Design a binder for these strands. Structure first.
Lengths: 103, 115, 104, 201, 49, 66, 49
RNA sequence: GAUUAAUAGGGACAGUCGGGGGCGUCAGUAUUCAAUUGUCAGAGGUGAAAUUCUUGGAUUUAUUGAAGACUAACAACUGCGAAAGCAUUCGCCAAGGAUGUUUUCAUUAAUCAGGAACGUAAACUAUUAGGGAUCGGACGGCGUUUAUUUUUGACCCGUUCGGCACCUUACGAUAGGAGUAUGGU
């Protein structure tokens, strides 16, 4: 029923990775990173959130993603992202930290 | 150097700067946090702890002990087990105005099983 | 003690991780824990029932009791560190200035 | 009335020292994240050693330490580093306005499967409710096994305390996030600065 | 083909496990004071006439 | 005899249950052991090694401990 | 092109076959301040020296 | 006159194993209540407040006493129980699991109609073929530490049964809504 609650929950990743939580270490690093201290960072976050809003309204494909890559760049990117998520899952299985369940 | 024992009860609502002798029985001088701030909102604040620590250190240097052993606590039964801003600010102001600090210990009441 | 002071001794003892081992958990079995606790209470009774209070404090200061528990429990399961974490004097039935000034 | 000034300038007679004990899987990460820790603690004036043989972090106040709350900052820092908070966040406790808290939540649910469900309900779908709570409360929340370790300002510590207890007591965190969003919207305008806000939640 | 690739990965895992078991039994048993028997010599069980 | 050891276990369980009276795990194990006794007893009846009018409810337990 | 990678050859052969400096060692390793049991052995060696 | 002794049973014995159960007992803090002192102006809550307690002294400081509750940290990709569930020590009482045995009757068994015992919530979801861990036995041993030297235990390794769970592979499988109009009531 509520709209702006649903918008705050989904866009929380993008806001908290942009600048909005100065006690979180990743957000306190991304508040001085440079791609958020530039001139129009708030507008670029607005474009990302508007793309996610139209995706929630029913768009199947995105505007911000790049569609053509030379197959070695995309394999390296996808393999590095999967290895990063797997290493975070293992270093959270040890230390007993519970994480968000997703396949 | 006469060591007096300073109990700093740092909660989230008010901070208690309290100075006793080595026994624990005879209170030398205490200044609560809310008696230095007009606002019950800002009763638990670093400014309140700074004013309380300055008044307590002034009284205890008029009595001439000039050395404290500091025991910091908080609401520990079903509470938070962490001191509020009063602890850090009161210890900072207390040693910034004289008062060679001795032994620091955080004696919070930790229940073995409460509820 | 022999001066009829009743007191409680609370001892704590953490399990020794053996060097040149690979397994992460150094768990003693429950029956082994019960044997360790039995040897602990036997040692503290046999080495605190014979002396007076002043000799008991003189043995508590360099921690002779925890050292002897560490030495005698290592045939059951080796213990990383044995301390006596609390001493509580419950009742002192005598006020004698003779021994109380023989202290000072 | 609330801002806190950095310490400008021997305040210690007895050379204070604290210790905490960590296991091996933390010994690896601490061994290769330690120079950041001892660099910032040398900037604060406190010597910090690590012992991979016994598995112990020690802090101790040196001759030239001047801030007396620095030893409490360092004790909390090595507590969080033992309790596996990541290293820049554990070093972020060394600022003036931060504080940590550990919330024991295993005592709140008698059942086990109900406890697992309510803990994962606190963590949310893809972590979105957790980072929404971190945004709305300006805190860092780490759902750590049977405990929950939070950091931040003292106001945010109190709000995440309330939200974690109410999440364990079967009130939904989406309901609590809606409550916090309403409170933020009401505290934005000071025309409604002192009323009883229970007519809105 | 996928079946042959998956089964040779499984065979490499099983052969490495068997080699590790044999090496640990050699390092902690009384076989440590012997020469390592070569694999071509281990290929034959017995020879008789 | 298997039946002899089973009824001995049954008398031991019932005596402990009479002394304690509050627990339910011993009552559940008593139900299991009495079902086991009746099944093995029925097989020994249909073989015929013991009297077909011999029965154990509690009085045979009493007269075999007595 | 075709010469030896000497470091890689030494590592391959390793995985196949498997009083003036010990003061600046402690000078370099007192600065970490990781305790690191090889340094405990070095401290006992320096105490014996 | 009486088979294989089953890679299905039930029992016996031995060392055990378990935060399984009952009864008693022993502690531990914490909370509340009360008392004794030092008090000497607020304390408590909240986003702010307010109700309330406060010179007969609140909150605080220290020390005792009582009551009721619960068993922090250890505490787990674990253990036990059929399930709900079960975490202080010690004693008693039976029971149970697995292993080992140079242990016995030899179909006793499998499945459930009928019946019988135990009892504020929800809310994002014949093998697989082995390997790495894990704990409970039993066996073996180059060795470090007990050990003043034999026991014995801890650590490492291998074999073997048994069991909670992980990953890979399948050996395979298979199970009306949203808008826009029009006319009635």
């Amino acid at each position: 029923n509520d709209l702006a609650l649903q918008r705050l929950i989904a866009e929380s990743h993008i806001l908290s990775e942009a600048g909005a939580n100065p006690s979180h270490w990743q957000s306190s690093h991304a508040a001085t990173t440079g791609t958020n201290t530039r001139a129009f960072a708030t507008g670029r976050i607005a474009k990302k959130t508007t793309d996610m809003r139209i995706q929630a309204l029913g768009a199947k494909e995105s505007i911000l993603t790049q569609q053509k890559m030379p197959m070695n760049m995309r394999k390296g990117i996808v393999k590095h992202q999967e290895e990063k998520e797997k290493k975070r899952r293992q270093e959270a299985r040890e230390n007993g930290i519970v994480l968000e369940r997703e396949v | 150097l006469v060591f007096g024992v300073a109990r700093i009860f740092a909660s989230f609502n008010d901070t208690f700067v309290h100075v006793t002798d080595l026994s624990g029985r005879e209170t030398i001088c205490r200044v609560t946090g809310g008696m230095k701030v007009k606002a019950d909102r800002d009763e638990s604040s670093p400014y309140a702890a700074m004013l309380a620590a300055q008044d307590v250190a002034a009284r205890c240097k008029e009595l001439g002990i000039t050395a404290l052993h500091i025991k910091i606590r908080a609401t520990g039964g079903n509470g938070t087990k962490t001191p509020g801003p009063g602890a850090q600010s009161a210890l900072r102001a207390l040693a910034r105005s004289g008062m060679k600090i001795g032994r620091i210990e955080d004696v919070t009441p930790t229940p073995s099983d409460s509820t | 003690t022999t001066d009829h002071y009743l007191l409680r001794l609370f001892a704590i003892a953490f399990t020794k991780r053996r060097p040149n081992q690979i397994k992460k958990t150094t768990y003693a079995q429950s029956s082994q824990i019960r044997a360790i606790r039995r040897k602990m209470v036997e040692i503290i009774q046999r080495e605190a029932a014979s002396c007076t209070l002043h000799q008991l404090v003189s043995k508590l200061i360099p921690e002779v009791i925890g050292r002897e528990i560490e030495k005698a429990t290592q045939g059951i399961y080796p213990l990383q560190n044995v301390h006596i974490r609390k001493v509580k004097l419950l009742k002192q039935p005598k006020f004698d200035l003779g021994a109380l000034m023989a202290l000072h | 009335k609330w801002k806190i000034e950095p310490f400008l300038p021997g305040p210690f007679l007895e050379e204070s020292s604290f210790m905490t004990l960590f296991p091996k899987y933390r010994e690896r990460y601490l061994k290769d994240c330690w120079p950041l820790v001892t660099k910032a603690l040398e900037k604060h004036g406190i010597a910090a050693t690590l012992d991979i043989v016994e598995g112990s972090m020690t802090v101790k106040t040196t001759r030239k330490t001047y801030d007396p709350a620095a030893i409490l900052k360092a004790r909390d820092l090595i507590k969080l580093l033992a309790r596996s908070v990541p290293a820049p966040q554990a070093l972020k406790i060394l600022e003036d306005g931060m504080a940590c808290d550990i919330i024991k939540i295993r005592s709140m649910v008698r059942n086990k499967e109900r406890f697992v469900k309510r803990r994962q309900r606190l963590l949310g779908q893809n972590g979105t409710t957790l980072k929404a709570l971190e945004l709305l409360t300006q805190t860092y929340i780490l759902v750590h096994g049977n405990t929950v370790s939070v950091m931040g300002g003292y106001k945010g510590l109190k709000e995440v305390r309330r939200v974690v207890e109410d999440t364990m007591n079967n009130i939904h965190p989406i309901y609590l996030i809606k409550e916090l969003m309403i409170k933020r919207e009401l505290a934005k305008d000071p025309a409604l600065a002192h009323e009883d806000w229970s007519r809105y939640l | 083909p996928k079946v042959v690739k998956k089964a040779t990965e499984i065979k490499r895992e099983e052969l490495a496990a068997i080699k590790r078991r044999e090496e640990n039994e050699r390092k902690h048993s009384n076989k440590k004071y012997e020469k390592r028997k070569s694999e071509r010599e281990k290929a034959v069980l017995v020879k008789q006439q | 005899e298997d039946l002899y050891f089973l009824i001995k276990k049954a008398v031991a369980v019932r005596k402990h249950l009479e002394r304690n009276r509050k627990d339910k795990d011993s009552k559940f194990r008593l139900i299991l052991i009495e079902s086991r006794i009746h099944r093995l007893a029925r097989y020994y009846k249909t073989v015929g090694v013991l009297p077909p009018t011999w029965k154990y409810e509690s009085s045979t337990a009493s007269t075999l401990v007595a | 092109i075709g010469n030896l990678d000497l470091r890689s050859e030494k590592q391959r052969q390793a995985e196949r076959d498997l009083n003036t400096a010990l003061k600046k060692y402690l000078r370099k390793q007192r600065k970490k301040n990781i305790i690191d049991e090889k340094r405990l052995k070095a401290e006992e060696l320096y105490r014996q020296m």
